[PDB]
Symmetry: D2
Subunit: 450 residues, 4 copies
Amino acid sequence: TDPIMEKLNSSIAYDQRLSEVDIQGSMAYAKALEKAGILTKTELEKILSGLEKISEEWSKGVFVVKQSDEDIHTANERRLKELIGDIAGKLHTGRSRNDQVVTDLKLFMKNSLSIISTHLLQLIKTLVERAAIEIDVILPGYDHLQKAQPIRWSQFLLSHAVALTRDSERLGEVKKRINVLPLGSGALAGNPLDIDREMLRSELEFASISLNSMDAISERDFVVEFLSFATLLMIHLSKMAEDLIIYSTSEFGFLTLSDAFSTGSSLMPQKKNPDSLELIRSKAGRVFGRLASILMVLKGLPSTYNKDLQEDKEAVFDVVDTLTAVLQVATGVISTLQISKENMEKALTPEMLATDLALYLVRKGVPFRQAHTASGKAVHLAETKGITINKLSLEDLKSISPQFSSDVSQVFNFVNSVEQYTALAGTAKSSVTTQIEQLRELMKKQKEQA
Amino acid sequence: TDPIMEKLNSSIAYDQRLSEVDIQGSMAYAKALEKAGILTKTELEKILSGLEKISEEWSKGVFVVKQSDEDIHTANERRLKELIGDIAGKLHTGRSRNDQVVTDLKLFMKNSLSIISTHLLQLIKTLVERAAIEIDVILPGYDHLQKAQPIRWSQFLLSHAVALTRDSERLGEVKKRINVLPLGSGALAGNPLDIDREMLRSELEFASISLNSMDAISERDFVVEFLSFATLLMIHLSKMAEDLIIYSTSEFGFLTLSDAFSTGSSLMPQKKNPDSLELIRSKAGRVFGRLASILMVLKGLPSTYNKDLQEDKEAVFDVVDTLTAVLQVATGVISTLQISKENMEKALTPEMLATDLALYLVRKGVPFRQAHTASGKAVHLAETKGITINKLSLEDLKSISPQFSSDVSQVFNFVNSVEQYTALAGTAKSSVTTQIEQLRELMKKQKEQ
Amino acid sequence: TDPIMEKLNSSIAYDQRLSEVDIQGSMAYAKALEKAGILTKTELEKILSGLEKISEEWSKGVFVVKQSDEDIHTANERRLKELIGDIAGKLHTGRSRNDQVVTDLKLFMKNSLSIISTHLLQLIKTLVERAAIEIDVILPGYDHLQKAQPIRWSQFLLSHAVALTRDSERLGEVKKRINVLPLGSGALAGNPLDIDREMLRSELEFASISLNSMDAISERDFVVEFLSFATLLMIHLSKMAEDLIIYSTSEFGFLTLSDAFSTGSSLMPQKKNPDSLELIRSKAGRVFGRLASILMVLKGLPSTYNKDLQEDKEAVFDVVDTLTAVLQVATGVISTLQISKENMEKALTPEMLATDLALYLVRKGVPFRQAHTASGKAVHLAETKGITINKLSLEDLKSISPQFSSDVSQVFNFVNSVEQYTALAGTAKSSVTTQIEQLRELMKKQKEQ
Amino acid sequence: TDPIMEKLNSSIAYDQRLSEVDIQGSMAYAKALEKAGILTKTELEKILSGLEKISEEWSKGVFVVKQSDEDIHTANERRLKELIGDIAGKLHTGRSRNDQVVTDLKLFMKNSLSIISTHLLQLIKTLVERAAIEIDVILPGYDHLQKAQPIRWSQFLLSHAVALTRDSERLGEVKKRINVLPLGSGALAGNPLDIDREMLRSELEFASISLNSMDAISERDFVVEFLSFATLLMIHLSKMAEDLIIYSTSEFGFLTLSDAFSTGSSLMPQKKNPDSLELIRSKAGRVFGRLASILMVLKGLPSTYNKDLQEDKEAVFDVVDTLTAVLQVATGVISTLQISKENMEKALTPEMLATDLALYLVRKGVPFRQAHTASGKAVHLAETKGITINKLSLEDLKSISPQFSSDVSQVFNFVNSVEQYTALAGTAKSSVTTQIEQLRELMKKQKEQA
């Protein structure tokens, strides 16, 4: 009754996208009511005909929302009544807004996750395929954002792809629990008409049916874990965005975003602002905010239904839209960015091979400590000689350790450096090739699970 | 190094519980080094022997931590050197603190999750078996905390068991990803000595090995999702606590917690403070806090390793200890509480049967709207006569709808009320029985897993 | 430019409520540009005239947003040019979207906080008025949701008013830092035309001007602060909602919400669902979520301007609208609810006076512990006799302690019970009256801010 | 009586730091009980003398905790009864753990905030002093982490100091509400003995007394807003840390941390890892987590006292210790870091002066739009000629606009560039000098206030 309460309760402004799933839920329910003998066959066919008409109206974008419609459910109900009359009312028999709305949200989320999966797998495939093509590129691997050791650019790309693949796996786990029918739980204690929930499951294409009515009505686990999945995915995208923003600075100069995913001024044509990456990074907080809100909404609520649960819709809709846009923007950025092999290569310095120099002695039998001490001495000798370690003479090296032989010159090669990492998961070309094949197979498995 | 800086790096105060998994990881690495020819059989034997001694020291609780030890890892390395000499130093060949620590954490969590799983399944089993025993008990079902319709007490217990079974399922998913060997990732680019990672996997009993060195070293997905699993589980426990706290008020009077999980005064002997439930509820905030911290810690960090990741340990340890204690208290609470079948039944009122009266008409073929209106008129008529609806005469009912027959008297029975819900998942006895069977089967599956 | 990125960069969809403040900001800047010699007097006249017309177009609701407008700033800029031509373009001289946007958001928030303040103060005033008028009502005070000791219903109402008054004080602190002018900070290094920022401050009515251009452009402390204030305020309202929902249950039976703030069913006319309170309680999570998002957005960002900052608008707009609605609903609920003085009074029991019986002995000299033991004995004695302690005879009491005299009968009076609490802040009537006077004095000052 | 419960209820492992404020609270209450006649003037003597003893024991490190002490309160009480016997029991008269604990926590927080204030103001002071010393240093100002325009290094340092002064201002606001006496609220309905709360206030040195007993017992606003203050402060430090980490990369090369606040290897002696900054950044999440936990703990709790509130202690202690250490480390970092004026200056490029080139026309009366267009055309002409804008000949410039005169040469000077920003708050030297003055005044006033 209160005008402000009334405004707070209205959701027609944001839930119209539930139009089709809402109709589908009603068609399925109508068929079950008919089996239960609540509707005659002629009544069922009139209702289905009407519902199908409404579906088409939304599909064609001709549906007319009216001022009285406070939500999508009321709008669809008004339209069906207009089309078929009083018979429409029988559809509420044994059904509650409590199980009808949660059914709508799950069907909607199932469909959204299917779309998110497509965009996520496309992002992963884009990283994997670019890694395959640019597998010969080498640049600095960073630790504490300080140059540490040479790595293949592809090992970097794949590190992001692997993390995203775990997000895809979580997406599949979340979808599995979402794909469980809640309809037929009634208001709280179950459907009172011995409704055939297996028929509802089959009609709505859910994988199984809810185990307990009170739980099905009041739980929002599916909302929470979708938000947890989305937040972790965003954390990964924020790390990738941070990496690309830094690598795109003029200071690092490793890559340049395309005009399509950056902003700039005619005054400074070469200055490309990574708008795309900053947008992506920022959405991690926007999504995390939604996760935080729902956990707080649910914390400490008693059984069974409480109006507090209505906050679920806006959080889900926002995150679905955000991920859909963000994943596609990320695919665009990765597929269209331009790397500078020249600058990546020039960043490789002899100082980054001192560890390899110690490793060289290790493979000759020199103990860890002594191998490192000797390498350190080579570094110091080079310094006092005013040169770099790759330029010390063999005689220079032997003055530090007789274990240094002429083959030590092979240490001072950046390809030889990355090729030491043949153990699985490493940056050697063979290891990177293996990861690309492993990821291609994971994507295939996940693609079919979806 | 700055003294304040040094205090901030020190983790020895809380990471000593990684002592055993740290030794285990080193034994497996030493064996791999021998296979790679970095260690001789003799060196390997001497290293393993010293590691066995350190393990025994921690076990006997005699390990001596020294003021110079910054962390559990340094303590063990120092002790190994003290025990066997500088050959101990060869153990670090090709291994970084970066892949060594993440290995220890995953080993620790795998073990901790096995423990949490046992306690979680015991809580669910407790709920399910009590639901079976008290299946005949009926009480009010609440909607917006207002009495709505009769339901079986067992339907309520099982609503919680079902939610907890989903938490168990997520626990299994999280465990599978934690059960992946990260050791042999080196500092960032992988292990430089072509170390046998399959051998490491086998010795440490991981199910598979990490796919990428940079990811394996820098990701803390496993911590995040463990914290997400833990938070959602705590949300469920906070809800059950809220329910039980309200049902235990003297106003509701449905149940009383045992003395072991409540507190009170000799001045008001019949009053019991739901101590245990309030503690359980508050832990939702505590665990959520850890989830929030690690997500913020990870946000915006660049590749590959950054010192920020050290915040993981304290968050993991706190949540592991919190869930372990909370799950056991919850089981104790559910197991030992006493219900008042008397008060639960006395709370059932005729007014809570008006919906059933409309449903009676629906079954006779009266359209939804008309049935609702007819029941409403019955409720209003009874109000005008100063009686309850179960007291209206058949004649009074017929004046409202000729569809009311003599069998309408069956509507005013609370057992008949709950027995309407035979559709799967409902509160009818047969449906509750099916739920118990399904949950017993589920627990069996999850325990085998 | 990628179409999806274009849409994501588009703010026009939600930033239109900044229309008027955007214009006010431009009017002030134009005036300063003329003083700086960038605009002539006639140009200034035409520009101010055009700006006023755009302002009227927005207020009349006839403003035409075009597909090319990516944000409100672009919209007003395009419109001004359509109205007055080429000279419109001189208005942006030395200005950046960076200082234009923070100026707009701060002006919007200043106005919004004045509105929120009005509603917050009305809520407190509504609670205080109710506490004054229902000052004789006594009901149980709760400890762990268990009946503890009698308290005045007014003390309960005032506990909520006191907390909300602290929220009002924080509101004032946030408003002061928001009331600082950022305009004239340029894109990063400051305004390049020696613009008169004091004139800008005076025209826009800000209290002072920002100290550093880089900070002014990149900080969103004012957003975070507002969000922390809003979140703590919602926590307070979530607690009040929890209380009223519990008290409104038929089990407690203390109060009933009006039809305007609850939902009902003709099938159960006595049952009222407190959906207004459930709504309020749920908004705490919604508001908290905005606070968590902005904190995460800002965490780890480098200097100076970053596109990430654009997430501020939607979070502020949502919390502003949420607070404005919830506060008014809360006021209505408190103002229109109906208490049952009968049920609140019936809820007071003799058992709740056992602590008073002990205090009675304490005032006569018996030490803490001994008085406690004595009372416990009286409770137990009453139990063995199957009676309430107020029914015990004086000899029954003397057998326990000789300090029990005939006047111990005064202990068994609920009004006498609450009247023991005369120490400042207690539930005695004199203390409650003092509280009412203190809160009114506080509000007077706060409104005078 | 459950064992796990007892373990969860224990806090002796972490609340001993409340030993002294606990004793001060008991001394204050003892005195009031006397004035109220609960204690004889000689019972007050035995009690006080005994408390002052326990005070000495704790301050000597000789206090002995027993396996029976579950918390600091019980420890101090057990000990009081060991020193003076049974009489110590009268101290509980009319007082509750509910009001005793909040009192201890507020007294503890008041003292901790004075310490935090000292470290915070010292950090601000170090930034401002450094800004005054290095006022002549110029480097790039960044927009989207891309070089935008010249700015003074001091403008960057002061931007951080200004944000920190707002944190200092919030600290003071939080302290004021913490400086309110809760003792004498009893368990819920207030103190039942007409205790003199003004005396309690005066003894404990609180500024005023709590207004309502139920609120004073159950509110934890002071904890929440201390945590909000701490979190925003950490956000500021997380930003300064991010900046310094990036500027310390070899790629940027603008500064180097001292050995005391970084870590390094003998193998790469020139590589310094910014451990201190990474540690500082990581604590934003740790502190935010405490804020998040307490907000969730409080949400939905009914009046009045609930055990849930006990989570306050650990959250406050953690954040107090975290802030105390972090602020001191930041002060050390800023104070001892080494800048490379050469590299900061070398980072300034002519392309960063295109905006200045347009402003040059603006000051000659050319409208904003045409000035920007002309500059854009100058930039393009230079680009096609393969030269920088400062190398375009005056003839080239005039081909773009006759308004370009020989004095346009003054535009291509980075000092002239920063000196344009004389409007208050800008980067011109006079403006930076004014900021330093204002911040000195602000620090003086905040220190004076508290």
